[PDB]
Symmetry: D2
Subunit: 332 residues, 4 copies
Amino acid sequence: CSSLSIRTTDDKSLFARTMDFTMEPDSKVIIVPRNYGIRLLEKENVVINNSYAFVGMGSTDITSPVLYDGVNEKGLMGAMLYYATFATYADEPKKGTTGINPVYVISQVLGNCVTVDDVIEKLTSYTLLNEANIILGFAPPLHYTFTDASGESIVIEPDKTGITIHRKTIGVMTNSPGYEWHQTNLRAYIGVTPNPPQDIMMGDLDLTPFGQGAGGLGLPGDFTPSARFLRVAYWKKYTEKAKNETEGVTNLFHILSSVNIPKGVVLTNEGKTDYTIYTSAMCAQSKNYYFKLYDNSRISAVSLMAENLNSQDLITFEWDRKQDIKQLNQVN
Amino acid sequence: CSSLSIRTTDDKSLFARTMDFTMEPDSKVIIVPRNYGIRLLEKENVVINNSYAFVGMGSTDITSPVLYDGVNEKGLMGAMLYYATFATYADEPKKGTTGINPVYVISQVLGNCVTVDDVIEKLTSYTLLNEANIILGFAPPLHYTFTDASGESIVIEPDKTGITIHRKTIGVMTNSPGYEWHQTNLRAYIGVTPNPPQDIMMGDLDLTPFGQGAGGLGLPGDFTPSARFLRVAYWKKYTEKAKNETEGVTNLFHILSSVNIPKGVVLTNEGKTDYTIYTSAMCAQSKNYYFKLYDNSRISAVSLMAENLNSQDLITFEWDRKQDIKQLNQVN
Amino acid sequence: CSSLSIRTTDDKSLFARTMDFTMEPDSKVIIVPRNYGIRLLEKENVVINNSYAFVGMGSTDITSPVLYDGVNEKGLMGAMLYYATFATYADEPKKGTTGINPVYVISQVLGNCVTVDDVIEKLTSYTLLNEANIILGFAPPLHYTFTDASGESIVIEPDKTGITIHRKTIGVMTNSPGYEWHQTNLRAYIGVTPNPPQDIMMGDLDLTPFGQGAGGLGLPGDFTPSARFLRVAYWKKYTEKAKNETEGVTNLFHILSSVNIPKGVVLTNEGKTDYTIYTSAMCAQSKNYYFKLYDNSRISAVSLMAENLNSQDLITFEWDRKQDIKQLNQVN
Amino acid sequence: CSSLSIRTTDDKSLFARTMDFTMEPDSKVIIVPRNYGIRLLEKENVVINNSYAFVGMGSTDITSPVLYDGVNEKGLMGAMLYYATFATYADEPKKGTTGINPVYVISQVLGNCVTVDDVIEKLTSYTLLNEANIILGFAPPLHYTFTDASGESIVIEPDKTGITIHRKTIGVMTNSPGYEWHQTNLRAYIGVTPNPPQDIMMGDLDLTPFGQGAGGLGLPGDFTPSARFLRVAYWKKYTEKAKNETEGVTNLFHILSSVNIPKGVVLTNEGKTDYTIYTSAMCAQSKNYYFKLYDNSRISAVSLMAENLNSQDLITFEWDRKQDIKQLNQVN
């Protein structure tokens, strides 16, 4: 998975992510209403009451709705992404803290926080535990990112020595390794720019580029997390600034198209295909949720505020998994 | 520009291209009917009457429609891509050849040829002339690619020494340098694969990948013509086979997404942005023309056979430069 | 700079390093004898009594003999390499410690310790000071590395958090950034091997590598600290094992030939050229010290055990800076 | 194998090469005197009288001496390098020409030619043939390079379509593919320079290089024919100009250290180690022949003009394959 957040020229904040995985667990956009209540653990029945409503992609087939990403009624946006070989969860809660399943952190944070400071507060009172789940069969190695309505972004990583928190980040996150490693890794590639190198001479040979794009020499094109991070990071820097929210979604999807994995190009050791199942964006100010699927290139939008936020039911919207082609003339 | 041709399990031939440029000329999807008549040169008041009807993206700013790509009523597909520093044209035609403006090649070929052999046979009796056009002010350096209903692709490059013909290519083409150069360059990247490398040990240290995608280490991520040829070539080899026409349109666009350029990340040395204006796809068997725009991610389709192929005028369809978002709710 | 330890088949531990710099400080191979006495600070006359004698490369033109690297009578070797932008020093000594000019660390350590555990313990009671020197005009940002005769290497880093020590490393060290970052960076390159990739097909094309060596696709070839690290680490792993001390030295120099910088290929921001001034090697069990210059590819050896270790004078050998070519038949 | 020529400030022409192979056949430096007689075919008994005397590395196992590289008394210098999967030979001589074994091309040219234009004329009356030889069992795939005293370089390549000659090349050559593929490949790596990239900001982050040598970002480090060509071509352009012959030799061996292959790091698909057996250098004006070996870092020189060039027998020098270490203190 890959993600970033941009800030538009009309002071809107947006967050976007791609979901790469080897299977498609039953998913849909979930609107969770105020006061529905999210569990902390699958084996413990304590349920926290959520103050805020929120919208995002998630699963509704374990006790509480698990969200993969989403936006608040207060503008907090967040996502949980893979963090293989680095995520380490405790076996029993730390003293004075309550246990929490890694899969419920986005739901809980989105339901009760407004700010990145608040997120820092809340996770400080919990202990990510090694509790499994029936949708996967185990507690997945995760790391999380949040961006409030102001634009500030944080990265929370469950490291071996504990919860590591990164503040005022560049607003880019993919998978392992840790955030500090990738941020340092940026320094190796500051030569990657949009501008062409100067033509040089070898003897009497005048050497010139083949076309355009030669300033990018050095950028890796593979789909590892390190290469995905650099491409999102450098294309975030140099892509034109969005002037409004719809441009923001457009530009964000254009940036994530460089890290979009077609089916068949990346296989795991188990021989399974890891591909970009869906791509989504969200705007803090408007609280609109946008998504496109591997099979459908047309963007769909759901508005949080338009629903009844005191509903007693989860409001869900189904994936339209057909290429939504516009026929200009009665096409076969 | 990036382009490739794919074959479905359905026995369908599809061709797709990205249009990368620094300016957007007024372009539309044009249906030119039979016996419409296409010029050879802008200076000569002579038109050649065309036997076949065809659909594609082009311009109507000069005397005859200039098509950038398209499909004819017999299933021949083709496109003109940039070939900077290599395209070489003449001032006067070679004896026994007629002169042709480089910008009219697709229009003339689509209107009168059925097969890749006809293309080769017909281009042989012309000399690409140095005639400028009102739209850009000079004769663009171009190379051409064609794919017929059998799925055979050729490449035509107006080189220094003359027109070079490449029969039976791998169905991939970008920009300079010559096709043969790119085909040889493929051999250096043979180890770019979907599968992950085996873990290795260094002393007492276990070295394992950071996540997935490690098999592709070595592939370039810049937007030079040579890097883009590689990404389209290798992702074409490893993307799952398309089962039918619509899945083929979808896979083509996924492959081409890795060579999609966002506004700003590539600049000419005069500071102009070179981005992907549109992405198009065509099917030889159904004669459907599909496209999506920089600003609109939803695919639009035009059917060539639904129109009156004997019509006396051009049938044109205009661009919808607005993100065609589906509201699942009342979204703002 | 670049360094690496290695272990022979005859149970020997050798160490080697390169010295890359923009200028040549008057240097020679200084032997320092038992109880000679080394300062700690330049603006402070306290001298500690070395109990051991050691050889290495160094300068003499400040109060005590500053050693760049070297071995001793107990088999301890180590080197000081650059660490730009990370190296942080204190202004006054941590209460319980004593100030030491960064440049005297090897001298001090080399004269008094026998093991990597000893070196930690010794360093434990010190506080690297910001005391400049007359040779450069400031205190160089540095990081240190030691290998004992057992074969264990350790990296010592004056980090902003404070001294960071890495025990049992892979025996590779280069410049910035920290040791952990480079060690993590190695996991992204595990596919870089000696073996060739399998041939593949694209359509009808058979694609074979051009010649040998296609297994290393992905390894960078630039002279940055990150790339030199990988090249040395991977080449250290796959280079055949040394059967003896002199086969060890030869192998060490073959590995460092991939990180050897000719004059002029690397320029600093000021305009100075950064090249490999010299390349040294050492054996812990024989205490032999080998080296070659940028202008002399012949290796010169110097034994510590032939010299009178109890002298009260610095036994120094000078550089033969002329290409030592062996004529087989007599001319110029 | 990697090769290059260089001009000094002294007005001298030097040529150097690495010999990369999987076995070391019995090899020695050989002087072949005037009028000695060299065969064309190993099976046919026509010998050609050589007008000139020449030195170089080679073998005496088959009938005439076979030279891998060398310099003649008129300053012509040259070498035969591997051209796997491209070199195509004939079974029968084209009419009007004589058949010549591919392994005798250096000896025949050095013995009878002065100028690069002479070489071209000579070669026009021969037809390279598919005759094997006893040391290998088959005719090795090969391509050739020559530089005369004036410093003009040429590349000769026996391609499927006929003998391809390249005039006034950049004076760099390795293995496959063909010279024009490599020359065009240079244009993709034009941004590889000695200078560092400008620092950048990513939001609040100040992004800066780790150390030096960041301007080389994008240059490969593997030992394939194409990467070796890039490093030699680019390090040749930026390395300081050689002032005299001794600098020339030193400079040539520094450049070739970036393409020097330690044993074990490159394996063939048959498990054989491919490494750099010897590195040689030559000067057209002085006619000195210099070389170093895998196991011997010291340069040995042989002077052609210090011998009786009218001698009736070959004059040969054996490799001293012992590390020639200069003991400075009666070391062990």
